[PDB]
Amino acid sequence: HTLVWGVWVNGVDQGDGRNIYIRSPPNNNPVKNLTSPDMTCNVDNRVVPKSVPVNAGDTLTFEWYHNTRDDDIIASSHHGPIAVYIAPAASNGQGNVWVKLFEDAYNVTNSTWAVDRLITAHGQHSVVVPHVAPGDYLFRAEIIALHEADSLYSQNPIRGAQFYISCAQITINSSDDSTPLPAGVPFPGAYTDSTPGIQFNIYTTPATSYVAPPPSVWSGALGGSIAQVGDASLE
Protein backbone atom coordinates (compact mmCIF):
# COMPACT_ATOMS: atom_id res chain seq x y z
CA HIS A 1 0.00 0.00 0.00
CA THR A 2 1.97 3.02 -1.38
CA LEU A 3 1.44 6.22 -3.45
CA VAL A 4 3.58 8.84 -5.20
CA TRP A 5 3.96 12.13 -3.25
CA GLY A 6 5.72 14.05 -6.02
CA VAL A 7 8.86 14.16 -8.16
CA TRP A 8 12.34 15.73 -8.11
CA VAL A 9 14.13 17.06 -11.24
CA ASN A 10 17.97 17.04 -11.03
CA GLY A 11 17.66 16.82 -7.20
CA VAL A 12 15.21 19.80 -7.00
CA ASP A 13 11.89 18.92 -5.30
CA GLN A 14 8.90 19.89 -7.51
CA GLY A 15 6.65 19.92 -4.43
CA ASP A 16 3.50 17.96 -3.48
CA GLY A 17 2.11 16.67 -6.78
CA ARG A 18 -0.96 14.79 -5.46
CA ASN A 19 -3.99 15.63 -7.72
CA ILE A 20 -1.80 18.44 -9.24
CA TYR A 21 0.70 16.79 -11.66
CA ILE A 22 0.13 13.15 -10.41
CA ARG A 23 -3.14 11.42 -11.51
CA SER A 24 -3.56 10.33 -7.88
CA PRO A 25 -6.05 7.57 -6.98
CA PRO A 26 -8.26 8.11 -3.90
CA ASN A 27 -6.20 5.75 -1.71
CA ASN A 28 -3.15 3.45 -1.62
CA ASN A 29 -5.02 0.14 -2.38
CA PRO A 30 -3.50 -2.02 -5.15
CA VAL A 31 -4.91 -2.86 -8.59
CA LYS A 32 -5.02 -6.69 -8.98
CA ASN A 33 -7.36 -7.40 -11.97
CA LEU A 34 -5.03 -7.73 -15.03
CA THR A 35 -7.90 -6.94 -17.51
CA SER A 36 -9.14 -3.85 -15.50
CA PRO A 37 -9.14 -0.39 -17.12
CA ASP A 38 -7.51 0.57 -13.73
CA MET A 39 -4.24 -1.07 -15.00
CA THR A 40 -3.58 2.00 -17.24
CA CYS A 41 -3.06 4.72 -14.58
CA ASN A 42 -4.91 3.35 -11.47
CA VAL A 43 -8.58 3.97 -10.57
CA ASP A 44 -8.81 7.78 -11.21
CA ASN A 45 -7.19 8.37 -14.64
CA ARG A 46 -8.01 11.95 -15.73
CA VAL A 47 -6.05 15.05 -16.79
CA VAL A 48 -4.76 16.97 -13.71
CA PRO A 49 -3.94 20.71 -13.96
CA LYS A 50 -0.08 20.76 -14.07
CA SER A 51 2.69 19.00 -16.06
CA VAL A 52 6.30 19.07 -14.71
CA PRO A 53 8.79 20.63 -17.16
CA VAL A 54 11.96 18.63 -17.83
CA ASN A 55 14.66 18.43 -20.50
CA ALA A 56 16.07 15.26 -22.11
CA GLY A 57 18.94 13.89 -19.94
CA ASP A 58 17.48 15.27 -16.67
CA THR A 59 17.30 12.91 -13.68
CA LEU A 60 13.58 12.46 -12.81
CA THR A 61 13.01 10.96 -9.33
CA PHE A 62 9.64 9.56 -8.17
CA GLU A 63 9.05 9.74 -4.39
CA TRP A 64 6.70 7.14 -2.81
CA TYR A 65 5.09 7.09 0.66
CA HIS A 66 2.68 4.92 2.67
CA ASN A 67 0.49 7.21 4.88
CA THR A 68 2.65 10.33 5.31
CA ARG A 69 5.70 11.73 3.49
CA ASP A 70 9.08 9.98 4.09
CA ASP A 71 7.52 7.33 6.44
CA ASP A 72 8.04 3.53 6.13
CA ILE A 73 7.20 3.95 2.33
CA ILE A 74 5.71 0.42 1.86
CA ALA A 75 5.25 -2.63 4.15
CA SER A 76 8.55 -4.67 4.17
CA SER A 77 6.44 -7.85 3.32
CA HIS A 78 5.74 -6.37 -0.18
CA HIS A 79 8.84 -7.76 -1.98
CA GLY A 80 8.88 -7.32 -5.73
CA PRO A 81 10.10 -5.39 -8.79
CA ILE A 82 9.81 -1.76 -9.95
CA ALA A 83 9.29 -0.59 -13.54
CA VAL A 84 8.82 2.81 -15.27
CA TYR A 85 7.00 3.24 -18.60
CA ILE A 86 6.42 6.29 -20.86
CA ALA A 87 3.54 7.10 -23.26
CA PRO A 88 2.56 10.27 -25.22
CA ALA A 89 -0.04 12.21 -23.15
CA ALA A 90 -2.50 12.55 -26.12
CA SER A 91 -3.05 8.74 -25.94
CA ASN A 92 -4.41 9.05 -22.34
CA GLY A 93 -2.52 5.69 -21.89
CA GLN A 94 -4.87 3.89 -24.34
CA GLY A 95 -3.70 1.56 -27.11
CA ASN A 96 -0.25 0.12 -27.86
CA VAL A 97 1.65 3.08 -26.38
CA TRP A 98 3.64 2.12 -23.21
CA VAL A 99 7.44 1.88 -23.64
CA LYS A 100 9.52 0.54 -20.72
CA LEU A 101 12.35 2.83 -19.55
CA PHE A 102 13.44 1.00 -16.33
CA GLU A 103 13.20 -2.42 -14.69
CA ASP A 104 14.77 -3.62 -11.37
CA ALA A 105 13.66 -6.95 -9.88
CA TYR A 106 15.91 -9.12 -7.61
CA ASN A 107 19.59 -8.05 -7.36
CA VAL A 108 21.72 -11.23 -6.98
CA THR A 109 24.86 -9.14 -6.01
CA ASN A 110 23.02 -7.39 -3.03
CA SER A 111 20.48 -10.28 -2.32
CA THR A 112 17.64 -7.65 -2.29
CA TRP A 113 14.45 -6.93 -4.16
CA ALA A 114 13.90 -3.48 -5.70
CA VAL A 115 11.11 -2.73 -3.14
CA ASP A 116 13.59 -3.49 -0.25
CA ARG A 117 16.04 -0.93 -1.82
CA LEU A 118 13.18 1.57 -2.37
CA ILE A 119 12.53 1.58 1.41
CA THR A 120 16.28 2.18 2.11
CA ALA A 121 16.13 5.04 -0.51
CA HIS A 122 13.28 6.82 1.42
CA GLY A 123 10.85 6.03 -1.42
CA GLN A 124 13.04 7.44 -4.25
CA HIS A 125 13.82 5.88 -7.65
CA SER A 126 14.97 7.72 -10.80
CA VAL A 127 15.11 7.55 -14.59
CA VAL A 128 17.11 9.58 -17.14
CA VAL A 129 14.57 11.50 -19.32
CA PRO A 130 14.98 9.97 -22.82
CA HIS A 131 15.72 11.95 -26.05
CA VAL A 132 12.15 11.65 -27.47
CA ALA A 133 10.16 14.36 -29.31
CA PRO A 134 9.36 17.45 -27.26
CA GLY A 135 5.83 17.44 -25.86
CA ASP A 136 3.57 16.06 -23.15
CA TYR A 137 4.09 12.56 -21.74
CA LEU A 138 2.78 10.26 -19.02
CA PHE A 139 5.42 8.50 -16.88
CA ARG A 140 3.83 5.37 -15.34
CA ALA A 141 5.74 4.08 -12.29
CA GLU A 142 4.70 0.53 -11.29
CA ILE A 143 5.60 -1.46 -8.13
CA ILE A 144 4.53 -5.13 -8.17
CA ALA A 145 4.23 -6.61 -4.66
CA LEU A 146 4.56 -10.43 -4.91
CA HIS A 147 3.88 -11.56 -1.29
CA GLU A 148 0.43 -13.03 -2.33
CA ALA A 149 1.38 -13.78 -6.01
CA ASP A 150 1.52 -17.61 -5.60
CA SER A 151 -2.21 -17.40 -6.58
CA LEU A 152 -3.69 -15.74 -9.64
CA TYR A 153 -6.22 -13.01 -8.75
CA SER A 154 -8.47 -14.73 -11.39
CA GLN A 155 -8.49 -17.95 -9.19
CA ASN A 156 -8.59 -16.25 -5.75
CA PRO A 157 -9.49 -12.54 -5.66
CA ILE A 158 -8.24 -12.10 -2.06
CA ARG A 159 -4.68 -12.89 -3.37
CA GLY A 160 -2.64 -12.18 -6.53
CA ALA A 161 0.15 -9.86 -7.58
CA GLN A 162 -0.49 -6.30 -6.34
CA PHE A 163 0.12 -3.37 -8.74
CA TYR A 164 0.86 0.07 -7.27
CA ILE A 165 0.56 2.28 -10.41
CA SER A 166 1.15 6.07 -10.50
CA CYS A 167 1.04 8.29 -13.65
CA ALA A 168 2.98 11.62 -13.56
CA GLN A 169 2.31 14.33 -16.17
CA ILE A 170 5.74 15.38 -17.54
CA THR A 171 6.44 17.95 -20.32
CA ILE A 172 9.74 17.39 -22.22
CA ASN A 173 10.88 20.85 -23.49
CA SER A 174 14.50 20.57 -24.76
CA SER A 175 15.13 17.31 -26.71
CA ASP A 176 17.11 16.60 -29.92
CA ASP A 177 14.77 13.54 -30.56
CA SER A 178 17.80 11.30 -31.22
CA THR A 179 15.61 8.30 -30.05
CA PRO A 180 12.05 8.77 -31.33
CA LEU A 181 9.54 6.91 -29.14
CA PRO A 182 8.16 3.78 -30.85
CA ALA A 183 4.78 2.06 -30.37
CA GLY A 184 4.56 0.11 -27.13
CA VAL A 185 2.38 -2.27 -25.16
CA PRO A 186 -1.18 -1.73 -23.87
CA PHE A 187 -2.22 -1.59 -20.17
CA PRO A 188 -4.46 -3.42 -19.58
CA GLY A 189 -3.29 -6.16 -21.98
CA ALA A 190 0.50 -6.58 -21.64
CA TYR A 191 0.20 -8.72 -18.46
CA THR A 192 -1.88 -11.94 -18.56
CA ASP A 193 -2.26 -15.01 -16.26
CA SER A 194 0.50 -16.78 -18.32
CA THR A 195 2.98 -13.79 -18.38
CA PRO A 196 6.34 -14.61 -16.63
CA GLY A 197 6.70 -12.83 -13.29
CA ILE A 198 2.93 -12.36 -12.53
CA GLN A 199 2.37 -15.72 -10.71
CA PHE A 200 5.40 -16.30 -8.44
CA ASN A 201 5.65 -18.00 -5.01
CA ILE A 202 8.27 -16.09 -2.89
CA TYR A 203 7.95 -18.78 -0.10
CA THR A 204 8.80 -21.79 -2.36
CA THR A 205 10.56 -20.35 -5.47
CA PRO A 206 14.07 -18.82 -5.08
CA ALA A 207 14.17 -15.09 -6.00
CA THR A 208 17.30 -15.95 -8.10
CA SER A 209 14.81 -17.70 -10.54
CA TYR A 210 12.45 -14.68 -10.86
CA VAL A 211 11.96 -13.26 -14.39
CA ALA A 212 10.16 -9.86 -14.46
CA PRO A 213 7.22 -9.44 -16.86
CA PRO A 214 8.03 -8.35 -20.40
CA PRO A 215 8.27 -6.11 -22.31
CA SER A 216 12.09 -5.69 -22.23
CA VAL A 217 13.59 -2.25 -21.51
CA TRP A 218 13.62 -0.10 -24.71
CA SER A 219 17.00 0.31 -26.48
CA GLY A 220 16.45 4.14 -26.26
CA ALA A 221 16.32 4.08 -22.43
CA LEU A 222 19.27 5.83 -20.70
CA GLY A 223 19.08 4.11 -17.28
CA GLY A 224 18.11 4.91 -13.72
CA SER A 225 18.69 4.14 -10.03
CA ILE A 226 17.01 3.25 -6.72
CA ALA A 227 18.68 5.78 -4.40
CA GLN A 228 17.88 8.84 -2.30
CA VAL A 229 18.53 11.97 -4.48
CA GLY A 230 16.93 14.49 -2.10
CA ASP A 231 16.49 14.84 1.67
CA ALA A 232 12.78 15.62 2.34
CA SER A 233 13.62 16.30 6.07
CA LEU A 234 15.81 19.40 5.11
CA GLU A 235 12.60 21.17 3.97
List contacts with Cu ion (CB under 5 A): 1
Q: How far is the CB of 157 from Cu ion (least distance, A)?
A: 15
| CA separation for the pair 69, 5 (Å, rounded) | 7
Binding site listing for Cu(2+): 1, 78, 164
Give min distance, CB of 128 to Cu ion, in A: 29
Residue 133 CB, nearest approach to Cu ion (Å): 37
The smaller minimum CB distance to Cu ion, of residues 1 and 69, is found at 1
CB of 139 vs Cu ion, minimal distance in Å = 22
Residue 83 or 161: the one with the smaller Cβ distance to Cu ion is 161
Which is nearer to Cu ion, 72 or 176 (by Cβ)? Answer: 72
Beta bridge partner(s), residue 83: 103, 142
- Environment class of 183 (CB within 10 Å of its CB; exposed 0-12, middle 13-18, buried 19+): exposed
- Known binding-site residues for O2 equal 147, 162
Specify the pairing of strand 52-54 against strand 162-172.
parallel
Q: How far is the CB of 55 from Cu ion (least distance, A)?
A: 35
In degrees, rounded to 5, the angle at the alpha carbon of residue 97 between the alpha carbons of residues 153 and 213 is 40
Residue number with CB closer to Cu ion (1 or 50): 1
In 3D space, the residue among 149, 178, 175, 151 whose CA is nearest the CA of residue 162 turns out to be 149
Nearer to Cu ion, 1 or 18 (CB): 1
